[PDB]
């Protein structure tokens, strides 16, 4: 089942409120035609350049960052163009991104919340409609709606009383989350 880690700072927050606020603050990096700048708003892959076990992106407007983990592939200009696909296992949110391919991986100096065992599986043929693409491109764009919807489904699968409107502490009591030190 989905497994959530959260700093105790967020114990009383709903998942939805946390994600709404986190993504709004992260803010759209404007990864769109005419506006992509390598090393500014592309993010990066480990080991890369366009594939790997992690994709990570910081907002330059500020040191808020996320890391997507799994088995990821980015098509770049190849058909279907500008598609992130593959297997998405985890999303970690926080700030102060560190590492990269030259370090052997990415990490957050302050990891606030992670969602693991997401089980998202998107074939290349689905293109930009795939769930992996929607989740991650959403986050790049300051929009956690797609992530929220996938988490909500995973929580309901455990029990229909559980949802993104549960608090992190409620989810811990329900067996799907654990707290970490603030
Ligand atoms: C190493 C990381 C990446 C690089 C270097 C990169 C590079 C690019 C480039 C060069 C463009 C075209 C810019 C232009 O037309 O002027 C682009 C567009 C785009 N990229 Fe990325 N990208 C990266 C990661 C991602 C990821 C992870 C996603 C999805 C989750 C993504 C989604 C898109 C989308 C949706 C567009 C717009 C495509 C269009 O409107 O036709 N990119 N990217």
Distance of CA 141 to the CA centre of its chain: 12
Reported resolution, Å: 0.9
Quote the number of domains for the chain. 1
Ligand 1 centroid–CA 175 distance in Å is 37
End-to-end CA distance of the chain: 25
Cα separation, 105 vs 67, in Å, equals 10
**Residue nearest to ligand 1 atom 6, measured at CA:** 42
CB of residue 136 inside a 6 A radius of ligand 1: yes
CB of residue 43 inside a 6 A radius of ligand 1: yes
- As a three-state string, the secondary structure of 106-148 is EEEEEEEEEEECCCEEECHHHHHHCHHHHHHHHHHCCCCHHHH
What's the CATH number where 10 sits?
Answer: 3.30.1500.10
Ligand 1 centroid–CA 166 distance in Å is 34
Cα separation, 48 vs 165, in Å, equals 36
Phi–psi pair at 80, nearest 5 degrees: -80, 125
CB of residue 134 inside a 6 A radius of ligand 1: no
CB of residue 34 inside a 6 A radius of ligand 1: yes
- Contact 9/181 with Cβ under 8 angstroms? no
Beta bridge partners of 4: 115, 177
CB of residue 44 inside a 6 A radius of ligand 1: yes
List Cβ neighbours of 114 (8 Å cut-off, separation of 6 or more): 4, 5, 6, 90, 91, 92, 93
Cα separation, 173 vs 131, in Å, equals 29
Which DSSP letter does residue 179 get? E
Range of the domain at 105: 1-182
């Amino acid at each position: 089942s989905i497994s959530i880690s959260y700093s105790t700072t967020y114990s009383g927050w709903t998942v939805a409120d946390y994600l709404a606020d986190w993504s709004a603050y992260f803010g759209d990096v404007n990864h769109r035609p005419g506006q992509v700048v390598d090393g500014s708003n592309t993010g990066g892959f480990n080991p890369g350049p366009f594939d790997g076990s992690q994709y990570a992106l910081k907002s330059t407007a500020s040191d808020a960052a996320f890391i997507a983990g799994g088995d990821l592939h980015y098509t770049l200009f190849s058909n279907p163009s500008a598609t992130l696909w593959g297997k998405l296992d985890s999303i970690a949110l926080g700030d102060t991104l560190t590492g990269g391919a030259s370090s052997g991986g990415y990490a957050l100096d302050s990891q606030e919340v992670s969602f693991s065992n997401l089980g998202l599986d998107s074939p290349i043929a689905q293109g930009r409609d795939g769930t992996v693409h929607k989740v991650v491109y959403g986050l790049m764009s300051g929009d956690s709606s797609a992530l929220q919807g996938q988490i909500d489904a995973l929580l309901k699968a455990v029990d229909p009383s559980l949802s993104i409107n549960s608090t992190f502490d409620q989810l811990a009591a329900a067996g799907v989350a654990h707290a970490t030190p603030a």
